[model samples]
Target chain A: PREHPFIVTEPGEPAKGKKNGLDYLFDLYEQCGKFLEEVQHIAKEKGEKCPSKVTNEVFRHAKLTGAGYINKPKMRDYVHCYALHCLDVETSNNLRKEYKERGENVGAWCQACYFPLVKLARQNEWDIDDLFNRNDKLRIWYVPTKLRQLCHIERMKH
Target chain B: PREHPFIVTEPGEPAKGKKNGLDYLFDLYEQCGKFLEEVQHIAKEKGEKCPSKVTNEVFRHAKLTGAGYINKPKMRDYVHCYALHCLDVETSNNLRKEYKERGENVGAWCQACYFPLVKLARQNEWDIDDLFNRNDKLRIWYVPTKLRQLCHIERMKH
Candidate 1:
């Protein structure tokens, strides 16, 4: 039980026809990133690193918990990868280039998936209960995505 | 606005009648630590360094989002942070002793308060809807806990 884990940035949703939770979360990321850029722009005008307060506000506005696992998933796994890239365009684009050179299909990356399930709830169409499970007397838990499961297997090959 | 931030790792609940969200997250940290230790033990039995697969699994099992803000808040702030301790216990312990001698309040520190959402959530007890706001047109909207608001003020003082 302890060994099995649930992660945020899974490869795909169960319903092929419907927009999955990850897609919805990516939308939130897009909105949040836009807001953060606005804030950062304002901060630049004032000559300060966007104050931590504002950054925190952006996180709250974005509805992320700032946990590490949700924010940076595998570059090859999700579509939200572009959000992080867009946040710091030059650096993230360079990183994307590097991945491309390594034969990575950078097209599918998602943006930040940093909020733990415990933090995300319904905002517009987002629904926590529908998106995740609270089984076995635990918090929201789920089986790892097939892609993520394969990550472990592929590692052994190297 | 997107500027206000709240973090977990609080001292107590506002009412002083119950444990706050940070306390529960701390328990997750302990459980996650214990599981990581077990994985390390298994790796030792096989005479191999704990593989990244196992480490990644440990993260997934932990159910954390792996955001830098959530994961490594203290290494840069506190002297005896967990990141250092996990990497090297003796060195961290020594650093802890040094901080103690310098009159640092080591007891108050916790690792997960990295983002400063006014605080954190209970893995089992936490509900995302209860903690965040969905009413605002903006996604980054949230009310700060008394504790997290104070953090920004105190940070500016230094």
Candidate 2:
């Protein structure tokens, strides 16, 4: 059930057992780290800790409905605009409902949106179904990675 | 503040630059690798993919109250009984309140209880005074390491 959904970061087809979902996710995680470094680099070039509209000025979200769980959409959209015009609002809302009903679902759900950093993904759309059932290690890495993806996208613009 | 709190899984104190706190946190992050090994070993001993109680019965948590923020206490206590009898309920509660005020705070606070996995905070009385004030890399390590600590404690017990 947990393995029902995942992203293949490789552009080409399977490489005779070359890598799996976890490995690609790690690749993306590293990508996000580099994205942050780039953001920091841009900051240094401009003499700033972090950019404002480009970076800072995080759209504050309370997650009142599901406190501990970061509202993935909010973070992706409000925190910064990834221009993920591809955001599947209905599915995202459904995940939010599931998360509200069973908050643990929020973990993987958030990762799905955050890991690829919403629209920052190589592919515009991915699945959120069964994502919550994955292990914590798999999900947590997505959080920062996703956040960084969005960070990179917005920073890229300005 | 930037210190990496570690467990004294040993008999006595250390000798030299032999660090424990923040460096100790680094130790726990490394220990997660070992904790996973133990889980696999326990799985082998039981002839099951994973022990239903010790491993599978994850008390699901949703960061709803703060979504991106894992409830430090809930993860430490409900997720598994770490017997960290030193957990200070009031201080924990306060951090929650503050996290509610600043969801970003959730990142670091979660690490404090989690890095030590609540009672696992080694010092037992480790202050949360400015825990939330720390950096992302520091707090991020706590989530998985803390999760692994809980897994190790419960798996080792039963």
Candidate 3:
């Protein structure tokens, strides 16, 4: 019964900064869109799958361009928001399709969303957890919370 | 509790199509793939979205090509199998993401799966239910049944 949608299972309310967790979520999507637009351009021009080298470069660009503070404590908010966004995106009725192919496609897309954080962590020699686990105050995490949130959105009546 | 997987509130067994319901589900996937490949080609060639004309023609192609007995009694099995297949595909960890975009993407894809049957019914002037219902002895339907079937597939232990 919290006043916010995503504050359920995480500590801290969604971040409130120059841009908050929701804003971060929106940026992640814009980055995702750019990534897709770039992938499509390369895929169409060369008539082949976009190369990993190309994608890594895009990930690097997203981290650098989208957030100035793309590291620890703060990154907790960014990645938390990002993961929730992915889960949010994946869980919409589309996640429960009968076909396993949809499963893999979405699983991979959600997994790929984690890589920008991975890249930032590697460049700074920080543990992935370091990026995710800030002081438990004023930071939020998503898990059982996101899953429950995901479930409640199904537009079906029992 | 029922002895079979999909027999919840529905009457009769899973349709034993010449190839059977599961087989029909598989064929629907194959048809979906061909549609994607064709759409990808058209998208690449013209630098634009694939045309609805092309897609509807493709849907019509799927019905004619996939199942020989693609009509009422038989199609019930096909369509039942089809919806379950879609629920299966969409639910495998992809559904319930926080973002609604995935909802619409998966939703559109799932709905598009229904169109091949739509073409057949319209061409024959058969009601959509005609394609969905059969003698209570050997046909099935999905709703609460499929949603329940859908809920069971989530791999979450909670």
Candidate 4:
């Protein structure tokens, strides 16, 4: 049930939209850009090339992400996904589990947290409950196991 | 606010991280890598090379915007300075007041969304936010008035 547990960005770019949950948890380029400008502006007191070029890459990514899947969809597991975006990844993954185990007994989850960058969807987007049973896009597990295992090895070395 | 923003990908790579944002946005290449991988995955199904390899330059430019100065203490008026990443020179120069107002507020919005791709920072234990905000990595703005006016002339000649 991919549709059941997952939401789409907008109707136009469902796959990209669906990728945001864990995607957002990792990148921080946008924040760095702003800091560069602040220091440059405070120090030089005017527009400068160095500061300008610094954030160029970071902001470009943000715009791309917004336009990437930036859409709204109604899915059953939106609350769990959005929470994951706000908190760290590990926390969100655990929540996605609690729901699967309890089978709808869990109550009161907020979906607003998911669309932190792009606010393009609403409740009327789709039939969320029925979709969860479909499991087309929904994965009961996190893939990229190799990346995670590598991370543990690197951490140990550190 | 600064600490909550972006992380630098590499320690000595000052230009890479600047002007990153809240929650999760990543480097252009990093985001590009993910986009290309997904594209490649789909392309593989169709027996084709990834389209991303062709448009890597364009995507790289887009990613640069993430490093703009959208998250400073008194950066309310500077958001539009970096709006060029999303808008053309003409559209950039003519950005309405409402645009800048909205831009300032969105400086620290979330980077990730509801997806399974947990970020490198969360998993691999890297200082991605610091990496993204290094050096004169932010203060990136340019007056597009001249560029836009030239475009109008070119259009009329045609």
Best model number under DockQ: 1
Clashes of 3: 32
Residue-by-residue lDDT tens digits, candidate 2, B1-158? 23333322222324234334222323332333334456655444433343212222221212222222222333333221121112443444444445445633323544544533433332423322113224222232222334544434543443
TM-score, candidate 3, is 0.21
Q: After superposition, how far is residue B13 of candidate 4 from its true place, in Å?
A: 42
lDDT of 3 by residue, B1-158 (tens): 21222111112225432323233334544544455467645543433333322244454544577533233333333443354334344431132222233433323444444433334334434333333343231123322233223222321221
The lowest-lDDT stretch of 10 consecutive residues in candidate 1 chain A is A134-143
Error of 1 at B136 (Å): 37
| lDDT digits (tens) for residues A31-60 of candidate 4 | 433444555554332212233333333344
User: Pick by TM-score: which candidate is best?
Assistant: 1
lDDT of 1 by residue, B88-125 (tens): 34544454455434544334333322222222323212
lDDT of 4 by residue, B120-139 (tens): 22332322222223312321
Score each candidate by Cα lDDT. Answer: 0.35, 0.33, 0.36, 0.32
Candidate 2 local lDDT, A31-149, one digit each (tens):
33344456645543442334212222221212232222232333332221111112343444444445444634323544454533334333422222113114232222222334434
Q: What TM-score results for chain B when candidate 4 is compared with the true chain B?
A: 0.22
lDDT of 4: 0.32
Clashes of 2: 32
